[PDB]
Design a protein around this ligand. Sequence first.
Ligand code: NA
Ligand code: NA
Ligand code: NA
Ligand code: NA
Ligand code: NA
Lengths: 92, 92, 92, 92
Amino acid sequence: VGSVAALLTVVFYIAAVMATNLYGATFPEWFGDLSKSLYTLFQVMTLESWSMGIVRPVMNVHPNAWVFFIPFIMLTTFTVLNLFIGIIVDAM
Amino acid sequence: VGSVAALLTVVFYIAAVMATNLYGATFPEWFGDLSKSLYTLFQVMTLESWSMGIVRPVMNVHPNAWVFFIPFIMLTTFTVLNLFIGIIVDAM
Amino acid sequence: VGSVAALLTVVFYIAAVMATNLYGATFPEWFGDLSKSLYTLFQVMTLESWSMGIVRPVMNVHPNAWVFFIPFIMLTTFTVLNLFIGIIVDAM
Amino acid sequence: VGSVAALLTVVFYIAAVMATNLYGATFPEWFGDLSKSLYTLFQVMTLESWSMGIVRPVMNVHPNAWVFFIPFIMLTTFTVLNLFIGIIVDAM
Ligand code: NA
Ligand code: NA
Ligand code: NA
Ligand code: NA
Ligand code: NA
């Protein structure tokens, strides 16, 4: 559980650094600084307006944006699901 | 199961009192009274428009709003997942 | 599994009859006929725009609409979760 | 696990070919080519704006669109849930 929660924190920090760098200048409200980025990636992780609200507008400037966001979702939504199950199993 | 469902009710009532107090005057449709608050926090819990629809507009007035909402989500979405699993395990 | 899937079909049909009757005349695009109702309740079940898109607009006419929709969500989202888990357990 | 992930890839490719053909000319931003289709169906699978954002606008042109999209959701959202559970079980 401890290693999974740490893996997620490292993945969240690398992705938020990458997103700040990639989409900060073109999309500043969403990825203008590491903090705006970390908040956005969390929203993307919960699946809230990920495509209509974030990814589709980003793609009109960066057509390949899906290469970053889709894997991010596939990885984080899996890790979170694994972490939540891991806590319950250990609690029993 | 009984203790988990009671923990959630107490957490939902404390958060809806806190939200009424914090964002009631600035965002009255969403947190103007305990009832509007309880309904909103449920919507936030289901993840429906949590960021684009509620949290981002709230943040333009209260920049730290994420300190309240993100933990609320992390706690309630975990407890609900734990409660739903708990019912099935006991049913077997 | 068979009894759970049948319970859900009966619950979906009763709710879609109730919604047609309650919100059909005031909200015809969403609940104007049993079929429009069944499609909407499915959208509500998946959690897609349930509050911002459906429930909040319905509440401006019917303030208690939450007494119908919130329990519907709590019941159907639990039954579906139970049904999906039930299929996997039986498959092993 | 390997057979489930392969089943999903085949289902995603058949559906994205079908959607290109069915709704490409009438809805080109969403289904104009196999790639736009694959990206959209993924968004539909995550449940993000599936009805308000995609299915309801598509239905104003193609009233039966629900015969394609609802089963697609029921199948893919089940397979993904089964695949994610399958990985954890094998990991133990
Ligand atoms: Na959801
Ligand atoms: Na939404
Ligand atoms: Na959603
Ligand atoms: Na979701
Ligand atoms: Na949405």
